[PDB]
């Protein structure tokens, strides 16, 4: 289905960074165009302006709440039976985990709440929805249950399962609480947190929405995959792993946007293939720092993003 790309510039961590030797200029959304443009320039050559176009660009002023205002309609399509993928891409420090897991705010916590509200609002229509989830990480192309792991693709239902991975029902906000509180401490920057490892691995929060209509007899199944990718910044075979996995993902998303998708070329794209094909909806989130000390990695992330939307 639809493939969208959003860029997100996080607030500068003052006293640590500044924009003294670079310039990132974001233009307002243009309806004439349908996209939003931004310009990046390095002080050592202000004549060379790198322009980038996206479906939407969030700046230092956009909060997580602001970000979700553009994500809500996407994730609610899962109640219609659509699969959805939301990827957070960017260098370590750009704000991927904050965007996806910030307590109560992140795309994941917000998505769960939004779905819950929709479930109840749909209850008055004969719909009974059930929600279950899994939280895993892909490190060095191996799957680890964060809550033997083999990927089982069901050509019949066009759904995917992973053997021996914990799955939890989400029928209470209390449950969502323990899980999310757990996910955050695992991936968020905390002194006693393995962010070193988290920066070198992909983390995927999978949510399955199964709805049945007692009277209408209709049924519905949609899966949401919320990915917090490994840092894209420029253990050699391991770095090559991260590098090739991220490059593979780009090839696939790009290919998918085209009018032989290399799904099997990486553990992540192979796992998510059913949620990436068909009328599935994909949202690529490119996180970048506004600071001059990261301008080069920033241009790399923005280049990856431009490819993925061609
Ligand atoms: N949108 C944001 N608003 C406020 N702080 C942010 C935002 N994004 C990131 N940060 C902060 O920036 C630092 C980088 O965070 P993080 O999301 O963990 O980066 P990454 O996951 O890309 O390595 C953290 O201290 C985080 O709290
Ligand atoms: Mg992180």
Distinctive features:
about 300 residues, alpha/beta, Kinesin, 9 helices, 14 strands, about 30% strand, globular, binds adenosine-5'-diphosphate, binds magnesium ion, contractile protein
> Cα-atom Rg, whole angstroms?
19 Å
What is bound: which ligands? Answer: adenosine-5'-diphosphate, magnesium ion
Largest sheet: 9 strands, mixed
Q: What is the CATH superfamily label?
A: Kinesin motor domain
Number of domains: 1
Helix proportion? 25-40%
**Termini separation:** 15 Å
Label the CATH architecture: 3-Layer(aba) Sandwich
Can you count the helices? 9
General form: globular
CATH topology: Kinesin
Can you describe this structure in just a few lines?
With 310 residues, the chain is an alpha/beta fold.
What features would you describe in this structure?
Helix content is 31%, strand content 29%. It contains nine helices and 14 strands. Strands 1, 5, 6, 7, 8, 11, 12, 13 and 14 form a nine-stranded mixed β-sheet that branches. Strands 2-3-4 form a three-stranded antiparallel β-sheet, with helices on one face. Helix 7 (236-257) packs parallel to helix 8 (267-276). The two termini are 15 Å apart. It has a single domain, classed as Kinesin (3-Layer(aba) Sandwich), CATH 3.40.850. The chain is of the alpha/beta class.
Q: Layout of SSEs?
A:
Blueprint: E1 3-9, E2 22-26, E3 36-42, E4 49-54, E5 56-58, H1 64-68, H2 72-75, E6 84-89, H3 96-101, H4 107-123, E7 127-139, E8 142-145, E9 151-154, E10 159-162, E11 168-169, H5 173-187, H6 195-199, E12 202-213, E13 219-228, H7 236-257, H8 267-276, E14 281-288, H9 295-307
Parallel strand pairs: 1-5, 1-14, 6-13, 6-14
Antiparallel strand pairs: 2-3, 3-4, 7-8, 7-11, 7-12, 9-10, 12-13
Helix pairs in contact: 7-8
The site of magnesium ion (MG) has 4 residues, from helix 3.
PDB class: contractile protein
Keywords: Kar3, Kinesin-related protein, motor protein, microtubule binding protein, contractile protein
Assembly: monomeric
């Amino acid at each position: 289905g639809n493939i969208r790309v959003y860029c997100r510039i996080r607030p500068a961590l003052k006293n640590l960074e500044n924009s003294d030797t670079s310039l990132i200029n974001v233009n307002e959304f243009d309806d004439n165009s349908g996209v939003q443009s931004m310009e990046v320039t390095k002080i050592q050559n202000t004549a060379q302006v790198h322009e980038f176009k996206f479906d939407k660009i969030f700046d230092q002023q956009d909060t997580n709440v602001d970000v979700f205002k553009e994500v809500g309609q996407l994730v609610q399509s899962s109640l219609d039976g659509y699969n959805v993928c939301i990827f957070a891409y960017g260098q370590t420090g750009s704000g991927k985990t904050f965007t996806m897991l910030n307590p109560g705010d992140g795309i994941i916590p917000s998505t769960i709440s939004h779905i819950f509200n929709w479930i109840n609002k749909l209850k008055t229509k004969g719909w009974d929805y059930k929600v279950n989830c899994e939280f895993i990480e892909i490190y060095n192309e191996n799957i680890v249950d964060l809550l033997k792991h083999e990927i089982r693709h069901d050509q019949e239902t066009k759904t995917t399962t992973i053997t021996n991975v914990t799955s939890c029902k989400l029928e209470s906000e209390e449950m969502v609480e323990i899980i999310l509180k757990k996910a955050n401490k695992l991936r968020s920057t905390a002194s006693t947190a393995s962010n070193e490892h988290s920066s070198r691995s992909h983390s995927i929060f999978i949510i399955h929405l199964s709805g049945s209509n007692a009277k209408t007899g209709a049924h519905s199944y949609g899966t949401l995959n919320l990915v917090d990718l490994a840092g894209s910044e420029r253990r050699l075979r391991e770095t090559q792993n991260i590098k090739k996995s991220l490059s593979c993902l780009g090839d696939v998303i790009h290919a998918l946007g085209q009018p032989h998708i290399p799904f099997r070329n990486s553990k992540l794209t192979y796992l998510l293939q059913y949620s990436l094909t068909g009328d599935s909806k994909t949202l690529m989130f490119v996180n970048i720092s506004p600071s001059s000390s990261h301008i080069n990695e920033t241009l790399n992330s923005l280049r990856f993003a431009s490819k993925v939307n061609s």
